[PDB]
Amino acid sequence: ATVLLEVPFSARGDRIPDAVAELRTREPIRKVRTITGAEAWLVSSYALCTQVLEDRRFSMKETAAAGAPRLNALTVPPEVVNNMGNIADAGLRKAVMKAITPKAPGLEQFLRDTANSLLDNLITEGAPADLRNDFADPLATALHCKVLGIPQEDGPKLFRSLSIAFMSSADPIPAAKINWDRDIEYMAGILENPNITTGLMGELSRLRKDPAYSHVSDELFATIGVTFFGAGVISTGSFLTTALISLIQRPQLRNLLHEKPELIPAGVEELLRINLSFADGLPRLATADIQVGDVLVRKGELVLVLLEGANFDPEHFPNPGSIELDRPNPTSHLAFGRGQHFCPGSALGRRHAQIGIEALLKKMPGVDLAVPIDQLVWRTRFQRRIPERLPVLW
Ligand code: HEM
Ligand SMILES: COc1ccc(C[C@@H]2NC(=O)[C@H](Cc3ccc(O)cc3)NC2=O)cc1
């Protein structure tokens, strides 16, 4: 007697388990047990992942309903599971999205300067260097302080909430509420601070005093700051970190992108496609009975969209494990999701990774792991796959 297949399969973010392909072939939607003990449907083919993400009857807000089968415990107030919907309902979607493009004057130059300064410090200190804690994460944190318009010196404290905020836990996490409430208070003070005039928080501070938004709650304005900092920093930092591993493990690609930096955008798009940063499938709750492949998903059931199931599906991406810069469908991956909840920071995430990689390859053309790959320590029970340290030499 075996137990019901448990998710997630592996916290390792440097390789996809052979099991994913077997599962996609045999049972591209199948029943699994989550860490809470709930049952869920795991969807692992490109076709079925797209179907679920493009059908709004598979709801992200309803995953927060009391009594629902859960992938993991909430780490935010339940209304925040509907964050983007709340933002849209408040009339703020266009302004938020405009503030988080990489297009603001000087933003890309600030990113490049920051990356180069972080790399110069590592070179001065001497190998080995930790590219996660001393490059990718500080680069993400600095970027998001700039995008939000908040002081750079406030970044590290906000960042240190994230090792708990993005936990994937069976039970509620007391520290998550402590940090959430403190970070909300911080963002509320930012909105009241007359010196905060730029970035997302500068724009929200103005809209807050505009008569067209006089009934939007102060809680929502502060929540936008906390959530966009947290989601953005964790997602860009974790993606860049594991992209660097995939690049370092491919010396020929490292050398090609160093020699021909104009290929870095195509390279980053493939690194996005093969990325294992999301540790769990994307959760949705069925709000009706819906046929998905051979399974009639019933109202109230949990569905998990396995991004690497879609992105490594050979029926859509032939030779899926190979980085190929000339694919005919290069952005059609699901690394940024799809449908109603498509990532609003996708352009910023691309530019963060492109600039970080460009700077690394210029400063450290000889970059290589300083430990055997199996020695990386993969964070467990977390919503991203992250090596705790990424030791390199050059
Ligand atoms: C490479 C970096 C990034 C990756 C891989 C990524 C990935 C994703 C994915 C897969 C989703 C869909 C989640 C779902 O459907 O359940 C998503 C949504 C989201 N992302 Fe990103 N993201 C990145 C960068 C960012 C940045 C920079 C921000 C903000 C500054 C951000 C903010 C969000 C938000 C707020 C959502 C919710 C969107 C929605 O509900 O409508 N992300 N992201
Ligand atoms: C890209 O990752 C995600 C993750 C989750 C969601 C769904 C929904 N939307 C959000 O905006 C925030 C994100 C968030 C921010 C801070 C925090 O401490 C925890 C989570 N919470 C949500 O639950 C969307 C994207």
Distance CA 178, CA 228 (A): 18
Q: What type of residue is 56? A: R
**Closest to 74 in 3D by CA, of 194, 135, 5, 165:** 165
**Closest to 274 in 3D by CA, of 15, 10, 24, 3:** 15
Q: State if residue 86 touches ligand 2 by the CB under 6 angstroms criterion.
A: no
Torsion of CA 123, 124, 126, 130, to 10 degrees: -60
Tokens in use for 355? 């600039």
Relative to the CA of 339, which ligand 1 atom is closest? Answer: 15
Distance CA 241, CA 19 (A): 24
Q: State if residue 227 touches ligand 2 by the CB under 6 angstroms criterion.
A: yes
Q: What type of residue is 126? A: G
What's the CA-to-centroid distance between 139 and ligand 1, angstroms?
Answer: 17
What's the CA-to-centroid distance between 269 and ligand 1, angstroms?
Answer: 15
Count other C-beta atoms under 10 Å from residue 65's C-beta. Answer: 15
Tokens in use for 312? 């490594």
Classify each residue of 187-203 as buried b or exposed e, where b means 16 or more C-beta atoms within 10 Å of its C-beta. bbebbeeeebebbbbbb
CA 2 to chain centre: 33
Torsion of CA 185, 186, 189, 190, to 10 degrees: -140
Closest residue by CA, ligand 1 atom 3 = 235
Distance CA 90, CA 222 (A): 13
What's the CA-to-centroid distance between 303 and ligand 1, angstroms?
Answer: 18
Q: Are 50 and 311 in contact (CB under 8 A)?
A: no
**Closest to 391 in 3D by CA, of 120, 122, 13:** 122
Torsion of CA 150, 156, 157, 161, to 10 degrees: 110
Distance CA 273, CA 267 (A): 10
Residue ranges per domain, the chain? 1-394
What's the CA-to-centroid distance between 370 and ligand 1, angstroms?
Answer: 31
| Residue where the block lists tokens 């032939």 | 318
CA 194 to chain centre: 31
Distance CA 173, CA 129 (A): 32
Distance CA 100, CA 116 (A): 22
Distance CA 394, CA 381 (A): 32
Is 351 annotated in a binding site? The answer is no
Q: State if residue 83 touches ligand 2 by the CB under 6 angstroms criterion.
A: yes
Closest residue by CA, ligand 1 atom 33 = 343
Output the CA torsion sign for 22, 26, 29, 32: negative
> Is 105 exposed, middle or buried (CB count within 10 Å of its CB: 0-12, 13-18, 19+)?
exposed
| Residue where the block lists tokens 């009934």 | 215
Is 109 annotated in a binding site? The answer is no
Closest residue by CA, ligand 2 atom 18 = 165
What's the CA-to-centroid distance between 227 and ligand 2, angstroms?
Answer: 6
Q: Are 164 and 111 in contact (CB under 8 A)?
A: no
Q: Residue 107: what are its φ and ψ, rounded to 5°?
A: -65, -50
Pick the CATH number of 1-394 from 2.10.109.10, 1.10.630.10, 3.40.190.10, 3.90.226.10: 1.10.630.10
Indicate the top mutation candidate among 145, 235, 303 to test ligand 1's pocket, ranked by most ligand atoms within 8 A of CB.
235
Q: What type of residue is 143? A: L
CA 64 to chain centre: 20
What's the CA-to-centroid distance between 234 and ligand 1, angstroms?
Answer: 10
Distance CA 51, CA 292 (A): 8
Q: State if residue 93 touches ligand 1 by the CB under 6 angstroms criterion.
A: no
Q: Residue 334: what are its φ and ψ, rounded to 5°?
A: -105, 20
CA 21 to chain centre: 23
How are strands ordered across the β-sheet holding 129-130? 129-130, 391-393, 368-369
Q: Are 239 and 277 in contact (CB under 8 A)?
A: yes
Output the CA torsion sign for 63, 64, 70, 71: positive
Distance CA 73, CA 75 (A): 6
Identify residues after which the chain is interrupted (C–N over 2.5 A).
none
**Closest to 291 in 3D by CA, of 12, 82, 55, 72:** 55
Indicate which ligand has the atom closest to the C-alpha of 283: 1
Distance CA 244, CA 13 (A): 11
Q: State if residue 236 touches ligand 1 by the CB under 6 angstroms criterion.
A: yes
Is 75 annotated in a binding site? The answer is yes
In SS3 terms, the chain reads as: CCCCCECCCCCCCCCCCHHHHHHHHHCCEEEEECCCCCEEEEECCHHHHHHHHCCCCEECHHHHCCCCCCCCCCCCCHHHHHHHHHHHHCCCHHHHHHHCCCCCCCHHHHHHHHHHHHHHHHHHHCCCEECHHHHHHHHHHHHHHHHHCCCHHHHHHHHCCHHHHCECCCCCCHHHHHHHHHHHHHHHHHHHCCCCCCHHHHHHHHHHCCHHHCCCCHHHHHHHHHHHHHHHHHHHHHHHHHHHHHHHCCHHHHHHHHHCHHHHHHHHHHHHHCCCCECCCEEEEECCCEEECCEEECCCCEEEECHHHHHCCCCCCCCCCCCCCCCCCCCCCCCCCCHHHCCCCHHHHHHHHHHHHHHHHHHCCCCEECCCHHHCCECCCECECCECCCEEEC
Q: How far is CA 240 from CA 140, 272, 336, 354, 386, in A?
A: 9, 9, 14, 9, 10
Distance CA 11, CA 177 (A): 25
